[PDB]
Design an enzyme around this catalytic site. Structure first.
Site, PDB file in Angstrom:
ATOM      1  N   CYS A 117      99.958 -30.994  -0.489  1.00  0.00           N
ATOM      2  CA  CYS A 117      99.342 -29.871  -1.181  1.00  0.00           C
ATOM      3  C   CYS A 117     100.402 -28.772  -1.271  1.00  0.00           C
ATOM      4  O   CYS A 117     101.553 -29.075  -1.592  1.00  0.00           O
ATOM      5  CB  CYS A 117      98.032 -29.465  -0.488  1.00  0.00           C
ATOM      6  SG  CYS A 117      98.090 -29.294   1.366  1.00  0.00           S
ATOM      7  N   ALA A 166     101.224 -26.375   1.495  1.00  0.00           N
ATOM      8  CA  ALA A 166     101.886 -26.439   2.806  1.00  0.00           C
ATOM      9  C   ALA A 166     101.879 -27.835   3.431  1.00  0.00           C
ATOM     10  O   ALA A 166     102.666 -28.092   4.361  1.00  0.00           O
ATOM     11  CB  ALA A 166     101.227 -25.459   3.784  1.00  0.00           C
ATOM     12  N   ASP A 179      90.367 -22.673  -6.442  1.00  0.00           N
ATOM     13  CA  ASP A 179      91.395 -21.750  -5.963  1.00  0.00           C
ATOM     14  C   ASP A 179      91.036 -21.158  -4.595  1.00  0.00           C
ATOM     15  O   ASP A 179      91.914 -20.967  -3.750  1.00  0.00           O
ATOM     16  CB  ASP A 179      91.607 -20.596  -6.968  1.00  0.00           C
ATOM     17  CG  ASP A 179      92.682 -20.868  -8.039  1.00  0.00           C
ATOM     18  OD1 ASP A 179      93.198 -21.990  -8.189  1.00  0.00           O
ATOM     19  OD2 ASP A 179      93.026 -19.897  -8.768  1.00  0.00           O
ATOM     20  N   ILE A 238      99.205 -29.283   5.045  1.00  0.00           N
ATOM     21  CA  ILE A 238      98.392 -29.330   6.272  1.00  0.00           C
ATOM     22  C   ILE A 238      96.892 -29.162   6.041  1.00  0.00           C
ATOM     23  O   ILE A 238      96.082 -29.699   6.811  1.00  0.00           O
ATOM     24  CB  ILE A 238      98.899 -28.297   7.307  1.00  0.00           C
ATOM     25  CG1 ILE A 238      98.801 -26.874   6.778  1.00  0.00           C
ATOM     26  CG2 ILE A 238     100.321 -28.624   7.735  1.00  0.00           C
ATOM     27  CD1 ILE A 238      99.153 -25.791   7.833  1.00  0.00           C
ATOM     28  N   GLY A 239      96.475 -28.440   4.998  1.00  0.00           N
ATOM     29  CA  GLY A 239      95.051 -28.157   4.814  1.00  0.00           C
ATOM     30  C   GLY A 239      94.275 -29.208   4.022  1.00  0.00           C
ATOM     31  O   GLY A 239      93.641 -30.088   4.623  1.00  0.00           O
ATOM     32  N   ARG A 240      94.325 -29.140   2.683  1.00  0.00           N
ATOM     33  CA  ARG A 240      93.763 -30.220   1.856  1.00  0.00           C
ATOM     34  C   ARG A 240      94.331 -31.587   2.254  1.00  0.00           C
ATOM     35  O   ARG A 240      93.603 -32.595   2.287  1.00  0.00           O
ATOM     36  CB  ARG A 240      94.040 -29.953   0.370  1.00  0.00           C
ATOM     37  CG  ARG A 240      93.385 -28.674  -0.143  1.00  0.00           C
ATOM     38  CD  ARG A 240      93.807 -28.335  -1.571  1.00  0.00           C
ATOM     39  NE  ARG A 240      93.553 -26.934  -1.849  1.00  0.00           N
ATOM     40  CZ  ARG A 240      93.888 -26.332  -2.982  1.00  0.00           C
ATOM     41  NH1 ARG A 240      94.516 -27.024  -3.925  1.00  0.00           N
ATOM     42  NH2 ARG A 240      93.632 -25.031  -3.152  1.00  0.00           N
ATOM     43  N   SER A 241      95.641 -31.649   2.507  1.00  0.00           N
ATOM     44  CA  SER A 241      96.284 -32.917   2.899  1.00  0.00           C
ATOM     45  C   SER A 241      95.678 -33.465   4.185  1.00  0.00           C
ATOM     46  O   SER A 241      95.483 -34.686   4.326  1.00  0.00           O
ATOM     47  CB  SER A 241      97.788 -32.713   3.090  1.00  0.00           C
ATOM     48  OG  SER A 241      98.485 -32.471   1.858  1.00  0.00           O
ATOM     49  N   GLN A 244      92.990 -26.142   7.961  1.00  0.00           N
ATOM     50  CA  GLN A 244      93.449 -24.749   8.048  1.00  0.00           C
ATOM     51  C   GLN A 244      92.341 -23.725   8.251  1.00  0.00           C
ATOM     52  O   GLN A 244      92.650 -22.570   8.598  1.00  0.00           O
ATOM     53  CB  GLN A 244      94.183 -24.354   6.757  1.00  0.00           C
ATOM     54  CG  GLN A 244      95.588 -24.863   6.649  1.00  0.00           C
ATOM     55  CD  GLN A 244      96.246 -24.464   5.314  1.00  0.00           C
ATOM     56  OE1 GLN A 244      95.857 -24.929   4.235  1.00  0.00           O
ATOM     57  NE2 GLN A 244      97.217 -23.589   5.392  1.00  0.00           N
TER      58      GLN A 244
END
Ligand code: GV1
Ligand code: GV1
Ligand code: GV1
Ligand code: GV1
Length: 282
Positions: free
Chosen positions: A215, A217, A181, A219-222, A262
């Site tokens: 994910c 948004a 998380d 942009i981050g994990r993706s 991110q």
């Protein structure tokens, strides 16, 4: 500089935040006018995450062709990806319309439906074989065929039917279920194992449309997923693998969607994943 020793040099000097801010300063800025039209407000999850006009995926519709999704086309690596937000209650039909129209084989999901006590995306696939889903706005039917639950991820086989033509296709759902998380994973081992399972399925290969990765948004994990995949492929293709510059690859990807990676912790994790991954490949 090489990667593994640039890595230790940033750790010892504690400068990850400064490196990451440099990337943010140098990143491309292109218009996203279609995303900001008033008629599209309920098609965006976050007001500050939008697809660029030049690279956005268009739905094959004349009323409204908008979805919050971008085509990342990596020319040297010969890989393409579609990065998108987690579907919203009023965009689940658009999401599967995109999968159909772009001829994708696989969907990669890097979040849980609920995280931190809040909803991060809609329940957009069926959970029981005998309870299929119908999306009336785009005329598609989606059925759960099988499910394989493992310790870090789940793989599902889905059938998508275009109800207008009665054509059917098999879609593979790759769901990484254990990203924490808060923060990033301590070791990249399970994330790399997951990437290799997606590769082995054919979902990233040129005989199919681009993989769809999301994910919350998109942009981050993706961004971490496609950045690691592309860097490892370039290390296999080039005569000198130490020439692969992860910051330069990330800036190239940011020409096609804003905000990829991110946090400075996600940047460090991406370095770690590529470094460990390059040892297993050989
Ligand atoms: C034993 C087999 S065959 C087959 N074909 C498509 N999807 C599958 N998954 C991932 C459930 C399988 C499994 C688990
Ligand atoms: C015999 C086949 S085809 C195929 N396609 C994707 N993944 C697979 N594995 C290993 C889970 C397989 C297997 C085992
Ligand atoms: C025919 C296919 S596609 C596919 N993708 C992921 N895992 C799989 N296995 C090994 C369970 C399969 C199978 C058996
Ligand atoms: C980091 C990992 S996990 C794994 N599983 C199967 N094949 C692999 N290679 C060599 C393509 C890998 C790599 C490189």
């Amino acid at each position: 500089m090489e990667m593994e020793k640039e890595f230790e040099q940033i750790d010892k000097s504690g400068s990850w935040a400064a490196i990451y801010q440099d990337i943010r300063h140098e990143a491309s800025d292109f218009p996203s006018r279609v995303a900001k039209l008033p008629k599209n407000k309920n098609r965006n999850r976050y007001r500050d995450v939008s697809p660029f006009d030049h690279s956005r995926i268009k739905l094959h519709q004349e009323d409204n062709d908008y979805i919050n999704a971008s085509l990342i086309k990596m020319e040297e690596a010969q890989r393409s990806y579609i990065l998108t937000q987690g579907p919203l209650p009023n965009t689940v039909g658009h999401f599967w319309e995109m999968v159909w129209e772009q001829k994708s084989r696989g969907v990669v999901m890097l979040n849980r439906v609920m995280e931190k006590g809040s909803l991060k995306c809609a329940q957009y696939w069926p959970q029981k074989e005998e309870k299929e889903m119908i999306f009336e706005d785009t005329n598609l039917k989606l059925t759960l065929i099988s499910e394989d639950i493992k310790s870090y991820y789940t793989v599902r086989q889905l059938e998508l039917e275009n109800l207008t033509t009665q054509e059917t296709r098999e879609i593979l759902h790759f769901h990484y279920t254990t990203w924490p998380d808060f923060g990033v994973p301590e070791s990249p081992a399970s994330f790399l194992n997951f990437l290799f399972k997606v590769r082995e399925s054919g979902s990233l290969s040129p005989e199919h449309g681009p993989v769809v990765v999301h994910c919350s948004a998109g942009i981050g994990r993706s961004g971490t997923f496609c950045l690691a995949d592309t860097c490892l492929l370039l290390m296999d293709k080039r005569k000198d693998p130490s020439s692969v510059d992860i910051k330069k690859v990330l800036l190239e990807m940011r020409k096609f969607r804003m905000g990829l990676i991110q946090t400075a912790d996600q940047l460090r994790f991406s370095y770690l994943a590529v470094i460990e991954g390059a040892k297993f490949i050989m």
